[PDB]
Amino acid sequence: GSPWRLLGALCLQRPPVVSKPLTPLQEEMASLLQQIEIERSLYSDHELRALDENQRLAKKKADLHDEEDEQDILLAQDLEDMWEQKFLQFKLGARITEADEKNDRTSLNRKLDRNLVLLVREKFGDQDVWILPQAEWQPGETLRGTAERTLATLSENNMEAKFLGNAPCGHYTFKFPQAMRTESNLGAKVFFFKALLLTGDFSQAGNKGHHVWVTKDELGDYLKPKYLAQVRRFVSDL
Amino acid sequence: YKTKPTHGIGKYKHLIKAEEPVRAINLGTDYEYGVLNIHLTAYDMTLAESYAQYVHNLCNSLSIKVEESYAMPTKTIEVLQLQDQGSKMLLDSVLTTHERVVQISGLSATFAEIFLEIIQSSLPEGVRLSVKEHTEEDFKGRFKARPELEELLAKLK
Amino acid sequence: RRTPPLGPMPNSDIDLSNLERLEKYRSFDRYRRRAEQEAQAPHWWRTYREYFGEKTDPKEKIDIGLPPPKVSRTQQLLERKQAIQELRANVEEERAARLRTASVPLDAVRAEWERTCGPYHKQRLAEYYGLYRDLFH
Amino acid sequence: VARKERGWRTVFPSREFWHRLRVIRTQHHVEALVEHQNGKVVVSASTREWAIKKHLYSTRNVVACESIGRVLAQRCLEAGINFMVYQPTPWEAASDSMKRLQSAMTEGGVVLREPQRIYE
Amino acid sequence: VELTFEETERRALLLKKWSLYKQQERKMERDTIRAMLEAQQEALEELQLESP
RNA sequence: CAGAGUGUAGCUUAACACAAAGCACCCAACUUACACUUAGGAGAUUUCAACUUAACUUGACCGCUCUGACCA
């Protein structure tokens, strides 16, 4: 064998649920593009209906020459009122949920406009270290397959993940402390694989102490400075 | 001249791809993928066309060959809703589905993970992304149906 | 009967294996720019410049003028950048250029031209007229 | 009465001239050159010069191209160069920057067409 | 309806600011691709040494 | 942490001085799109003391890539 220990890590990421809010500069550009679009657009059927209805009122008030009585029951402006009333009654979903208010970094319902990365807490040498989910490589199994096996080893989860490619997205090599450092086990070589969380969530048995979901900006709170640097390379915050 | 050392200085066709005249689908190797179709489905025509332009420009900057950029036929579906205290379906709105397809090839297996990550992160709201391997059926779906050929084929059956 | 070329043939550096992946010119100007540079380079075959170009002496021309002035490049560059930033900061200057109404003072430009590029342009202009050829051989 | 280098009808540009106006536009600078047929540059005007750069908001726009033509026309008169030819590509001629530059050269007194050679 | 002088000036300045904004977006995206590519290639080299 | 190397914007053995250049890049129009074209947009010498020269020489200095320590 080799002195280093093969480890296959899974970089499970939750894609954003809602679109990111526009920047103040983009809001100005968005209004201009909408303004330009209206200027260069032809009259729509709704616009043509309003113009003709206004003319009919003039053709009915200035002179009594109109030869039709029924005309149209509902005017264009009146028709807009019905649409406006329905919109007010309808309530949109809350982009910022209770998880954001309570800072519940366990649920997936937080920061729907950002990217969440799964983190778990594992105890090594009577020390709690936050690392990405990982498992030891076994004979007769691909390196990517170990990461797939890591998902099945989680604490009561029915999550489905979509792996992208076979080559690892990154690596992290560390050596054990000199107290237990031996030639047989010099250290370990962690390999990261990214996947997309399609559906599923952990059960309500254990939440706070088991796993957390944080973005790249707040990812440094849990990871070690040496471990954080390697993770921040293959994890984007676009 | 042939005997002079400057022979062949004027040769130019060896620097030009031979263009000597539908298209055969080239399957990828064990390390590269074959011809891929990047479908872009959205209910807004502007969003579908704009993102297809973004994908087309992204591939050029990534040195990924683009086989062809084309638009699938627009699908129009009527939307009807049931009236209150009634059993009659009344038309509510008309929705048109616009699909834009960008065809690429020669994508590396290792680079596929990076390419797919970038495009999915930039996907606009209301736009559906679907990347499929190019097949003969997909290409044949862009052509008008031929009932006359079908009628003759039915006789043979 | 064939004779090997006396030197590197044109287009020999082009890799024909990856011709599809090689970047093309795609434009007339880009090819023309490369063509002009290629023509000026010396070649081992017969060229137009061989029979029509002036047979200048290979030795460098003797300079018999006053020594060049000493100018601090670091200080000169810093002042010029400051002047540009002040000019671009003006809203009217940006608007005038955007509206294509701006202009430069020819008298002010020439006065600065006499102190910076004047003597060098005059030497080139006098060289064209052959004053150095006749006055100083 | 001097011979113009006639020929080169299958290539571009033509060599049948005495002096030509050659304009070089780059990503950040615009340069205009008046060079003899033998290849010697007679006069030049470039936006790289601090004399012209200090008075230009941008050295890559139509104003810069028009300004170079005004400066070059003054230098051409001071150099005795009154006649020259211009050989633009179809897109360059239709460009607004070159039209302004040609107008500046014409308004400066320089004629953009050389007189024909006298053979008899 | 013809745009006023102030309205045209506002749009022109906005477009100039838009060019710089999109250039910075491309730089962030281009560096993101480079960061992923460097990490993936370095990881593959390390994996090959450990177990071909 | 230490040691070693490295130093113009993305690239460049561009920078004699007259000068921080050439290309790559970004928006817009044209283009289904790309491309060409036109018309625009943004850029750098890590910093300082040494014929005051000096992007260059040397030092310091800041940053940076590597070897190990360090590590779960």
Swiss-Prot record, chain A:
UniProt organism field: Homo sapiens
Subcellular localization: Mitochondrion
One Pfam family cited in the UniProt record for this chain: MRP-L46
Signal peptide: none
Primary subcellular site in the record, as a coarse category: mitochondrion
Molecular function, one GO term: structural constituent of ribosome
Top-level taxon in the UniProt lineage: Eukaryota
GO cellular component annotations of the record: cell junction; cytosol; mitochondrial inner membrane; mitochondrial large ribosomal subunit; mitochondrion; nucleoplasm
Protein name: Large ribosomal subunit protein mL46
GO biological process, one term: mitochondrial translation
PANTHER family, alphabetized: 39S RIBOSOMAL PROTEIN L46, MITOCHONDRIAL PRECURSOR-RELATED, LARGE RIBOSOMAL SUBUNIT PROTEIN ML46
Residue list for modification N6-acetyllysine: 189
UniProtKB/Swiss-Prot annotation, chain B:
Protein's name according to its UniProt entry: Large ribosomal subunit protein mL48
Domain of life: Eukaryota
Coiled-coil intervals, chain numbering: none
Localization terms from the record: Mitochondrion
Keyword list, A-Z: Mitochondrion, Ribonucleoprotein, Ribosomal protein, Transit peptide
Annotated family: Belongs to the mitochondrion-specific ribosomal protein mL48 family.
PTM-bearing positions, type N6-succinyllysine: 144
Taxonomic source organism: Homo sapiens (Human)
Organism lineage: Eukaryota, Metazoa, Chordata, Craniata, Vertebrata
An example Gene Ontology CC term for this record: mitochondrial ribosome
Keyword Ribonucleoprotein among UniProt keywords: yes
The encoding gene: MRPL48
Main location per the UniProt record: mitochondrion
Record text on subunit structure and interactions: Component of the mitochondrial large ribosomal subunit (mt-LSU). Mature mammalian 55S mitochondrial ribosomes consist of a small (28S) and a large (39S) subunit. The 28S small subunit contains a 12S ribosomal RNA (12S mt-rRNA) and 30 different proteins. The 39S large subunit contains a 16S rRNA (16S mt-rRNA), a copy of mitochondrial valine transfer RNA (mt-tRNA(Val)), which plays an integral structural role, and 52 different proteins. mL48 is located at the central protuberance. Interacts with OXA1L.
Included range, full protein: 48 to 212 of 212
Record flagged with keyword Secreted: no
GO biological process: mitochondrial translation
UniProtKB/Swiss-Prot annotation, chain C:
Top-level lineage group: Eukaryota
Coiled-coil portions: 73-101
Locations listed in the record: Mitochondrion
Subunit structure: Component of the mitochondrial large ribosomal subunit (mt-LSU). Mature mammalian 55S mitochondrial ribosomes consist of a small (28S) and a large (39S) subunit. The 28S small subunit contains a 12S ribosomal RNA (12S mt-rRNA) and 30 different proteins. The 39S large subunit contains a 16S rRNA (16S mt-rRNA), a copy of mitochondrial valine transfer RNA (mt-tRNA(Val)), which plays an integral structural role, and 52 different proteins. mL38 is located at the central protuberance.
Family per record: Belongs to the phosphatidylethanolamine-binding protein family. Mitochondrion-specific ribosomal protein mL38 subfamily.
The protein's name: Large ribosomal subunit protein mL38
Name of encoding gene: MRPL38
Residues of the full protein shown: 27 to 163 of 380
UniProtKB/Swiss-Prot annotation, chain D:
Gene Ontology CC terms: extracellular space; mitochondrial inner membrane; mitochondrial large ribosomal subunit; mitochondrial ribosome; mitochondrion
Cellular location(s): Mitochondrion
Mitochondrion keyword on record: yes
Keywords: Chaperone, Mitochondrion, Ribonucleoprotein, Ribosomal protein, RNA-binding, Transit peptide, Transport
Tagged with keyword RNA-binding: yes
GO biological process, one term: rRNA import into mitochondrion
Domain of life assignment: Eukaryota
One Gene Ontology term of the molecular function aspect: 5S rRNA binding
Primary residence: mitochondrion
Family statement drawn from the similarity comment of this UniProt entry: Belongs to the universal ribosomal protein uL18 family.
Subunit structure: Component of the mitochondrial large ribosomal subunit (mt-LSU). Mature mammalian 55S mitochondrial ribosomes consist of a small (28S) and a large (39S) subunit. The 28S small subunit contains a 12S ribosomal RNA (12S mt-rRNA) and 30 different proteins. The 39S large subunit contains a 16S rRNA (16S mt-rRNA), a copy of mitochondrial valine transfer RNA (mt-tRNA(Val)), which plays an integral structural role, and 52 different proteins.
Job of this protein: Together with thiosulfate sulfurtransferase (TST), acts as a mitochondrial import factor for the cytosolic 5S rRNA. The precursor form shows RNA chaperone activity; is able to fold the 5S rRNA into an import-competent conformation that is recognized by rhodanese (TST). Both the cytoplasmic and mitochondrial forms are able to bind to the helix IV-loop D in the gamma domain of the 5S rRNA.
Protein name per Swiss-Prot or TrEMBL: Large ribosomal subunit protein uL18m
Organism, as annotated: Homo sapiens
